[PDB]
Design a protein around this ligand. Structure first.
Ligand SMILES: Nc1nc(N)c2nc(-c3cccc(Br)c3)c(N)nc2n1
Ligand SMILES: [Zn+2]
Length: 286
């Protein structure tokens, strides 16, 4: 009967974050389910309050979850957020690990916008992946949310817009599977890299699997990833997916991406395929 002070009662583990796990909770006074993250106050480097600050800076942004509470309670730092629906990875598995082109396109629009909004707030995410996108609940079930800012970093000063310096010899942050080529080469991550990863995420959804899945280990993925040309990776799928990747890989370190161009590629393709813009995803068809 584990209780976060007076207000919340803890439940089962529902998730795994970059720093610590996510538990199902109840707000007793409200009669309402929530998602709860805990950090031991003794933790060597504490980021829970740091990560909450980012969320609250982002608040009001479309597809950004809302923080109900952040603070210290007993021997824990606590973050409580609004409860959201399943991740895209979860839903991928329920859809036999293949999304229809319509679903991938509907996702890509929203996912590109999420990344664009975070960039507008002077942050890069650095762990763009299917697990870090979640569907909303009820009336927001059609909305893709972005979560987990634990690896997120500020890429430019807010007032001056001074961009962070180019560096090399960096250790990889994020999942190797969706990491950009430059990230595998130890380059400092920037806006291009969030977008490049999103490209691998979309192709993952088209294919069911990437050529560098299921093969020392990090050098082996990097190799296969650098050995596989974009045309090879995207063969049998609309050229837009290769065009997206080639554009992202063209971008220099401090370049601003053209988010409208990339959205438009997929919007035009959507039109040519004749799909209804009805937000009816594959999982709604189940
Ligand atoms: N079904 C559901 N709902 C949520 N709201 C949710 N929230 C998160 C999340 C991520 C980072 C920090 C915190 Br607090 C929660 C998560 N990983 N999984 C989740 N799963
Ligand atoms: Zn706090």
């Amino acid at each position: 009967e584990l209780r976060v002070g007076n207000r919340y009662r803890l439940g089962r583990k529902i998730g795994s974050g970059s720093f610590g796990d996510i538990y199902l909770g109840t707000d007793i006074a409200a009669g309402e389910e929530v998602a709860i993250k805990l950090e031991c106050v003794k933790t060597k480097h504490p980021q829970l309050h740091i990560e909450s600050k980012i969320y609250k800076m982002m608040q009001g942004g479309v597809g950004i979850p809302t923080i109900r509470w952040c603070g210290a309670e007993g021997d824990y730092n606590v973050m409580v957020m609004e409860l959201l629906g399943p991740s895209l990875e979860d839903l991928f598995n329920f859809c036999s690990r293949k999304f229809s082109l319509k679903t991938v396109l509907l996702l890509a629009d929203q996912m590109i916008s999420r990344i664009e909004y975070i960039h507008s707030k002077n942050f890069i995410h650095r762990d763009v992946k299917p697990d870090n996108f979640l569907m909303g609940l009820g009336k927001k079930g059609n909305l893709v949310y972005i979560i987990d800012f634990g690896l997120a970093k500020k890429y430019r000063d807010a007032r001056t817009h001074q961009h962070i310096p180019y560096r090399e010899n960096k250790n990889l942050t994020g999942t190797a599977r969706y990491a950009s080529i430059n990230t595998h080469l130890g380059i400092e991550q920037s806006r291009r890299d969030d977008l490049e990863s999103l490209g691998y995420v979309l192709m993952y959804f088209n294919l069911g699997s990437l050529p560098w899945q299921g093969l020392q280990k990090y050098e082996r993925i990097s190799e296969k990833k650098m050995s596989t040309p974009i045309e090879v990776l995207c063969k049998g799928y609309p050229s837009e997916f290769a065009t997206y990747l080639n554009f992202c890989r063209s971008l220099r370190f401090d370049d601003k991406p053209d988010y409208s161009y990339l959205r438009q590629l997929f919007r035009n393709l959507f039109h040519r395929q004749g799909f209804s813009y009805d937000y009816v995803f594959d999982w709604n068809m189940l």
